[PDB]
Amino acid sequence: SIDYVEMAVNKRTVRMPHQLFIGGEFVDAEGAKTSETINPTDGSVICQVSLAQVTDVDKAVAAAKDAFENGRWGKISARDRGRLMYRLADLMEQHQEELATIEALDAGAVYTLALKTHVGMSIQTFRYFAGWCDKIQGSTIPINQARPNRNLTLTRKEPVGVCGIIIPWNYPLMMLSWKTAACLAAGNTVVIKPAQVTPLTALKFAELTLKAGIPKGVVNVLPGSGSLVGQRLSDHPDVRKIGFTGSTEVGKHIMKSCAISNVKKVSLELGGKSPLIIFADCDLNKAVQMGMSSVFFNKGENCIAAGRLFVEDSIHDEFVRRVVEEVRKMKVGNPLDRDTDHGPQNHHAHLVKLMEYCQHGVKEGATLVCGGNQVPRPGFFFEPTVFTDVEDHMFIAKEESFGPVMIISRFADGDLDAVLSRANATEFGLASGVFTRDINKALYVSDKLQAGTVFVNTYNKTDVAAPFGGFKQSGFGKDLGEAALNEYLRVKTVTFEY
Amino acid sequence: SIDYVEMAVNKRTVRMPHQLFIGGEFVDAEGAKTSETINPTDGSVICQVSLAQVTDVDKAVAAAKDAFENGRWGKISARDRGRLMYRLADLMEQHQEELATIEALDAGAVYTLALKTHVGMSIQTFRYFAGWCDKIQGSTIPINQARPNRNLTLTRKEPVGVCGIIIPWNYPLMMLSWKTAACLAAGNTVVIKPAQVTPLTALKFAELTLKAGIPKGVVNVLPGSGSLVGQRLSDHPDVRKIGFTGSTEVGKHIMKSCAISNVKKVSLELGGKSPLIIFADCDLNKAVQMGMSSVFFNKGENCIAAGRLFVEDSIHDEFVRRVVEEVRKMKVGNPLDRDTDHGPQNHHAHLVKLMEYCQHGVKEGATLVCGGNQVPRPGFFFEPTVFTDVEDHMFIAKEESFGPVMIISRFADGDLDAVLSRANATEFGLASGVFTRDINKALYVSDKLQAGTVFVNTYNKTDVAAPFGGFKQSGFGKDLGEAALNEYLRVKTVTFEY
Amino acid sequence: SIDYVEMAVNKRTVRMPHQLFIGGEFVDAEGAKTSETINPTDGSVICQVSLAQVTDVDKAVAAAKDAFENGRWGKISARDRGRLMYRLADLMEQHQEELATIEALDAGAVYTLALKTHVGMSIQTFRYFAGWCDKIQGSTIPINQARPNRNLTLTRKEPVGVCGIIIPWNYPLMMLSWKTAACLAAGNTVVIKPAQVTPLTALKFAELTLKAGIPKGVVNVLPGSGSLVGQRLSDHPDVRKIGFTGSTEVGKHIMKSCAISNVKKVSLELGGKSPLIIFADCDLNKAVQMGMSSVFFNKGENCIAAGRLFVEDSIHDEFVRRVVEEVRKMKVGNPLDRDTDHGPQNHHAHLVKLMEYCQHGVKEGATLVCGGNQVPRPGFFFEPTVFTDVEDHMFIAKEESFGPVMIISRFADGDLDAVLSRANATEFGLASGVFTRDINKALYVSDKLQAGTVFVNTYNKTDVAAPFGGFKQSGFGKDLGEAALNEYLRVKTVTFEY
Amino acid sequence: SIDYVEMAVNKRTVRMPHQLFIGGEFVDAEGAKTSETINPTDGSVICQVSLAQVTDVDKAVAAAKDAFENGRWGKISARDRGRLMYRLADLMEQHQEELATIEALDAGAVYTLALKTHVGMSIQTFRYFAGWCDKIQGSTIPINQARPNRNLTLTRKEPVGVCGIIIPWNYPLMMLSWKTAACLAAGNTVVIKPAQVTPLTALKFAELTLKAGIPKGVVNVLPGSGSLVGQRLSDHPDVRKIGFTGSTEVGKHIMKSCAISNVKKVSLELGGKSPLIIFADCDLNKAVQMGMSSVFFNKGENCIAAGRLFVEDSIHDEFVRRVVEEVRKMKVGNPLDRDTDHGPQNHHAHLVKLMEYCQHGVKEGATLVCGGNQVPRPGFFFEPTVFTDVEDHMFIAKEESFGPVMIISRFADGDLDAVLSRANATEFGLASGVFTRDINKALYVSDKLQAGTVFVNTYNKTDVAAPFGGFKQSGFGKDLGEAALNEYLRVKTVTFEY
């Protein structure tokens, strides 16, 4: 009998769950504590959400150890687990207008992608990663056949324990499923520390599993403070695995728990500085458009998006002045409004956090080729900014903006390794990109970039079986791929003899 | 023109290298600093060995970045790399009397295994792991074939960088090669922080590569202090990977560098508490002998050896009183002496470090069924001790002895899960064992033990293609196997389109 | 608008397809030719089925070359192919009472397995082998990196062409899916030459794909004469691959087309002489029961079933006299009748074909310990026969019975290699078996048997990811496993350079 | 005490073995039968070689079943087998002047490649394929873990039996080793039916194994008649495997034994019609030279060499008239003579067999742009011929020449699929080629060619780890690669339970 302040918004009764779903039920935090959520389109508040404490971390990793151990999920055969996980996708996509508008409402994400991605892109990873439940294998090798005896082996892939779930702030709901598939499938159960700014898409998901009847205590979400609930899950002895994506900061401090508390594996992701090295030889009509889609996607709140958009001289002002036109083409409106092409940032201070970045570089001597300050309306709409020719020593060409701020640079006509060593030199080593058509110019674009997905001639390809991770300065541990069930599952050995 | 105080010992001119082989040559430490080595058979000293400083860690990870980058090893085709690594095995096994007697002399290891293991067991892993040089593969998947375009992919396996080499103290030379194969092969070069108590087997190896002409700066060894040279390699920015085996201690403090300095992967191993659950149903003649070989091997200095030798009641005193006879059968003598069946421990205080362990349990109420104190001769020979019936709460049945101290326990006749939950409860989760013949009693021995190599009906199988690692409380990262070239090699992605 | 003589039988409207589904539709043979089907429970006929000609083999391998080339299946991306193949499993298992009762009706298979296997066992291999559609890989090696140039490679796995489908007679429907998964998945399309005695389970499957909307001309089934339709598919130039299981005869004559017509690969399976070497040490209660289930399964029409049931002396009459009781325990009734434990053979003359086998050995001097002749009822029920002690030179201990005729032999108490060389000497080298508990007696049971699945302590394990084939005298080419997509997919090479 | 008519030729005592090395010794054929060898440089004879009978095929496959079964090779551990096979490479390359000049003398091969390839290229495949002796693996999967029991598996890779060795006529010695590595390594032994025209390089190899002391009866070579010794090995029951490369003819008649005699696997290769589709965009200086090296290599006796050298219009006469100059540049001389760039064909009538091919096309209307008839000197030197513009219907543009007869065609400037469908239409589907630099023109060159090694921008790369085979009309079964030990080794299954 969970309570909801029923929100008949966007032609649908939005019920975004408030409680802390634990032990089979949604419940409040310590003493009926709470934590609100913000309407980023206006700065408004939406509703009340309980915010757990260190009172709860004693409860989640002990109550979600029920599903792991005793009930249905702990032991049911390989089929119905996926077959139950698969039925989730049956209910969920039916209610995309729930997860579309909600994530259109929670994190202000535009409705146009709120339908395609914010439910659709989740519908895929439910069914692609619900695959390997009854399909995962041993691989068991030729042990020493010890004469005069006869030997054997069979290693295997086994679940680990209980896991940590730190969804980032930017992509709240869809990046729940991207970490609700590779975690549950490996045999274990989950306990989620969502983003509390937009936790209402996250908490909305588990209610469907309620009807969907997954074994009790298999999935439990947990809003909370920044580094208490995270740390309290970051140090508990019971927890076995840990999922997070966010700043570069939290890890080097959170990764000191893992040197101490319980040596359990770690899974952290950091934002990046993808250099999108556009030559001019590619089709200039698409060198700008998908180039313009390369950065300004989903109002700039893109995880890997390339904020250093190199261009050859021959098309720069061309690419600029055309893109300069394209910077004007966008729509700023209600994300649930179909025509909306640009919405507000996630949060209030962050629009500040982006603007000074603009202000930083502009003071350096940066060609503020448009905007750079807040769109003059409630919420935190920001003017899509376009710098120019900013070299590396400046502060804008090193910091992660976290905004739709196209921050160009430039090089010599046809350069391969030098300026791309201005694409190679950034320590944020997540993504990359390139455009080209003569691929005697894509033979040296993708070999040498020490990046984690060394694209060529495209970008923006959020698709389920693209196995993904990051290199040095944005984490380790791969998501959205087969290795996702490479670490999540523990390797046993055996060694018989007769 | 390296200098050696030529040691014509054991019918052979022992030249154990003293210097710090860097930049292509063996050289001394800071200001001609040194660090001695101990003769564990007598407590004597052998010779002088320079001990590097933080002056050197600026030199190794910058000079061994030469082989990686510019010379032969950085770029030569896949064949001659193994073909050069393979020629190493041509020279080395010819001089087993070098690495046999030396390791018979350095770490006091008996000659009987000094020939079979301390060179022979190294001769294997040179040639089994010199295999995959020109044999390692991509595995490149079906990317979204994006209509109306046509797509592709090809991931790959790439070297990482420069690595850290902390050979443990116990198995000095052979465990060099076990980490001189999986490291060099992946494309990178190596820099070795050996055990300085017995660094003279370690430093002896690289001289053969000198004749063997491996590319310069590919292999460089480095004696040094405990946690300076280790830490100074534990924090440098240049270093990319790190190899160590030793105490459980150093990691939880060393693993705080990896949360900070440069996030590079880690590879650490800790000693263990393998419960060797001998039923009586196995052949009692071999239930004792290989059981007796299960612990007392190479004078107790065994990395995974089972120091909790469970036995059913029916054979306990039988297994005891027979093994009690077998505890007497052993030889204590010069390890290079063929008849020697038991030598001294590694080091002086450690024989203390083992004896109080004996003294600890005996004060608890432990049946000191023999010995327990130092063999009355120079060096640090120790009397093979046999306790009995020691339950878990005591200090001996929880601590790692690090000695040939057979520390029994006991259970009910035919028990499967309970007493093996006294085999399951220890957090040192490296090895295991079991004996049995009716393998309706090996169906529940090996499934449930949360250990890393869940043996059945044998033990002691140091062989090259037995892929090995540890579980929770002794590290993470697998050695001596195919996954050894699973982490050492970085995964790239590509994504074309036409 | 396919026609069906609607059969409201077994509480369900059996529509078993009659036509020759080609070019997208079910259609009749040459000139409206036909070929009937037999009710094996009674000798009755069920309905009319067109029987194609050499008029059709010009049509199938030219019309099913449509799906391969132009329509949806030829080019759709990796996902929906499985996603369309997966939706097949959505419809099909819903109508198990169709494929259960039909195969309960077509081939007289008992309903008890008609539900579990004759639809259930097909439901698995739809979903396990619908896996590898979007999951199959290249594996692309280190080509000579030719200095002063720079090289590469990427091999791949590609579909072959059009294939040949000869389902055997015994397991009509379920062995359709076992060859409807590994064939379709590799990129190609299929054309089926089913068993015309029981083609009504086979032809029933493709109607569901009609609703299931697989690309046109991807699947086409074809009843026909014995060695015309088979030969006419055995010699056509267009056909690229060929699937068949049946007698040892047809191949050595059919394999002369492959030396001539078009050199395309071949896939043939032959029945076998699995020696099921039961020691007595195994649990005698299960040494008989699963031993009795080892032969008499699905009324003896078992593909690999062990018809030489060795036993130690100590239990022979015991195992006999108990099994002698068990030979009486069985039910002979309507296969769709739940209590039915034994049904008729497939066909009329075959019950003859089995009885003389009985008659053969009995004339030799065989202890006809029960029955041996026809059950006195319509259809062709046969009395479960049990011989004894028949040695090898006789005709029964060499011929394939193709019946539930438990044909024992015997040996010395505890013999390992000699009598098992009466298990080793038979050239039918498909299966094997053994029972044992002390597995110092399963150390020499399974090493030396030159068989294709060298079982120990079980049998009867028809499961999807058990990769299966045969050795010398029963074919070559493996089914029900990963190598199934090892041959079906052609290996390309490439070799770049820059 | 083998006899040799000692030939102190080429500054070295050529001992080419005459006998039939069987049962450990070299011996003569039936009744001291013989079979000569021809000096192709002059038509001269070299010496006497016994030619076995069907008297011998009773001896080889029974005497070489000794090594397989009883002696050293049957059972010695994995190391020394390669270690003995590896020592072969120690002796053999030392005597390259033996195998260089001999093959310079036997098959008239030029000394320039007689050193690099005819011993050097053999020295590689001895050591690359002597690798996998002690390195080959199981791969043993997750069998149904059948609750309430606990299951396992371990498949493996096992030797097959005795094999058939039909070295072709063209590349006599080096193609011995290419089939002396993948055969011996898999556990079995070998019996060689070499080319009797040039059997003196072949028979020369096994003498070194005599000193090299491989286990007796592991290797036995056998000169003989065309289709008796081949057929007599083609039908024997004992033989298990079969190796041959030669005409397209012998197989479709020899492959009728395999449908009958003993169903054992088959390995046959046929010559090809590689279309070497040179665009003009590639460097025209190398478009001719390596193009000219693409066909005229080792005096035209090239197994896969592209005898249909397409060219764009823009460079045709250019490529022609320059290559026309290059057709003149070559040297015709003694193959052991260093300056020799062109030698005679293998045999007397074959130079006829090539000339009428010239005569065939020239009568069709072919531009005989040079030569076309015999070089006017003893032996069978042939004038390097260059046709032009010959379209497909003619006889020269369909037949395999088997000569250095550059037989051009032509197309439209920049054509991709049409004229390459004159590269795609030939049913000889072994090799291919292409030149290009803008690899928007190598994106459609290599995808669609139904060939077995779909080259781009190079050719002529005989290297050991290039896994090789053929497509439809030149055989099946891959050589010089990892799959070479994919078929040669039989797959076992096991299936335990507890």
Ligand SMILES: Cc1cc2c(C(C)C)c(O)c(O)c(C=O)c2c(O)c1-c1c(C)cc2c(C(C)C)c(O)c(O)c(C=O)c2c1O
């Ligand atoms: C991967 C693939 C899947 C296809 C499928 C799926 C959905 C089953 C079809 O259904 C289908 O109809 C296809 C036919 O078009 C088809 C197809 O062509 C390819 C393909 C492609 C796109 C490019 C290749 C290249 C490029 C660099 C040009 C190679 O270099 C190369 O070597 C290849 C070979 O491996 C190679 C190749 O196989």
